[PDB]
């Protein structure tokens, strides 16, 4: 299951 | 920063006339990712080609597989045509069954 990605 | 696709055409199995096989066109080492890939039977596009196995490498270049179920005959000829922004013209790589 993928991670919830952060913004940059 | 723009990388030219490498286009390799090849069947899953050693080709034998009359035997179901899979034809593959692996389009590799390209950037930008926007790309067009048509597989062709006797100059005519093959419908229902599957796009699979999309990945990238260390250098971040794109890799993707186009493939389709086919039954080779002696007369038929197969190619893969790719339009990518790094190429003046659309490059057709033909399937070489003796390769």
């Amino acid at each position: 299951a993928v991670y919830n990605f952060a913004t940059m | 920063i723009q990388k030219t696709p490498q286009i390799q055409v090849y069947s899953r199995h050693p080709p034998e006339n009359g035997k179901p096989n899979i034809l593959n066109c692996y389009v590799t080492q390209f950037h930008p990712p926007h790309i067009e890939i048509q597989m062709l039977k006797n100059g005519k596009k093959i419908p229902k080609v599957e796009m699979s196995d999309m990945s990238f490498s260390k250098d971040w270049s794109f890799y993707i597989l186009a493939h389709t179920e086919f039954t080779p005959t002696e007369t038929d000829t197969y190619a893969c045509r790719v339009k990518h922004d790094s190429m003046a013209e659309p490059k057709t790589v033909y399937w070489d069954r003796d390769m």
């Binding site: 299951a1 993928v2 991670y3 919830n4 990605f5 952060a6 913004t7 940059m8 | 920063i1 990388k3 390799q8 090849y10 899953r12 199995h13 050693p14 899979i22 034809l23 593959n24 692996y26 590799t28 950037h31 930008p32 990712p33 926007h34 599957e50 699979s52 196995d53 999309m54 990945s55 990238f56 250098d59 971040w60 270049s61 597989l65 493939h67 389709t68 003796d98 390769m99």
Partner: protein, 271 residues
């Protein structure tokens, strides 16, 4: 052996043609098993491996909405990075992400990774320690600073050490028959003429899984060579080839060797 869960993530702006294209493609080891594509008819996570049909509606809903959040998140990054790099707002750009964990055969974490690239150049990556970031340039520092201040490494470490590993275990177990299998290479050698009086000897390996393999040519002991990167054959197995140019009339002194997880003794063949 050790195994991997990998997500390849790509967001691609298309200014004038609408919203960025968003793709997430997941692999266990060398096998594609999941995919989301924002350009699909009605975008949602879908199985790419038969064994993933086991997973229920809740899984697909949870991954899909995660997917749709990320799509938005990368939407913002693309706009953010234009700022970071003082870039025009009319060109197409790419963000790429490699995110995943490897485990050993005891099912424990060997390695976690998460690496970003903007327009095909490195931007930022989790370091091996799983607490600090390495930024490829001045832009990436700004991002770095946000993730440090927001504690993203520690949230990412919970994922690489917890969520990522436990789901890899789940998938291996759920897809044992496909993922823990080994198919062995069948090899054969092909002959081509040239000028002036030379010969291309090409060694094929076919039908093998996992993707890992080694092909070498030899002139009586010493290893020698054009090749192609090992490559998927459309059914979940892989192939490769390696060729040498030899003298016409000396073909018999060259042999091809094939080493693979599925060959107890490596193969030896010649034209």
């Amino acid at each position: 052996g050790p195994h991997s869960l990998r997500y390849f993530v790509t967001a691609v702006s298309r200014p004038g043609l609408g919203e960025p294209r968003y793709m997430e493609v997941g692999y266990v080891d060398d096998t594609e098993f999941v995919r989301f594509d924002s350009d699909a008819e009605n975008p949602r996570y879908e199985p790419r491996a038969r064994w993933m049909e086991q997973e229920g509606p809740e899984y697909w809903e949870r991954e899909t909405q995660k997917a749709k959040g990320n799509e938005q998140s990368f939407r913002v990054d693309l706009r953010t990075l234009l700022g970071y790099y003082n870039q025009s707002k009319g060109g197409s750009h790419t963000i790429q992400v490699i995110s995943g964990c490897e485990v050993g055969s005891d099912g424990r974490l060997l390695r976690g990774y998460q690496q970003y690239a903007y327009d095909g150049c490195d931007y930022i990556a989790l370091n091996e320690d799983l607490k600090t970031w390495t930024a490829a340039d001045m832009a990436a520092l700004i991002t770095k600073h946000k993730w440090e201040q927001a504690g993203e490494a520690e949230r990412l470490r919970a994922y690489l050490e917890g969520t990522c590993v436990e789901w890899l275990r789940r998938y291996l177990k759920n897809g044992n028959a496909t993922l823990l299998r080994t198919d062995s290479p069948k090899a054969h050698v092909t002959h081509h003429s040239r000028p002036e009086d030379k010969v291309t000897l090409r060694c094929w390996a076919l039908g093998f899984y996992p993707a890992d393999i080694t092909l070498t040519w030899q002139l009586n002991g010493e290893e020698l060579m054009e090749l192609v990167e090992t490559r998927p054959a459309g059914d979940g197995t892989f192939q490769k080839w390696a060729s040498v140019v030899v003298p016409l009339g000396k073909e018999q002194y060259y042999t091809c060797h094939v080493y693979h997880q599925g060959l107890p003794e490596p193969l030896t063949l010649r034209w």
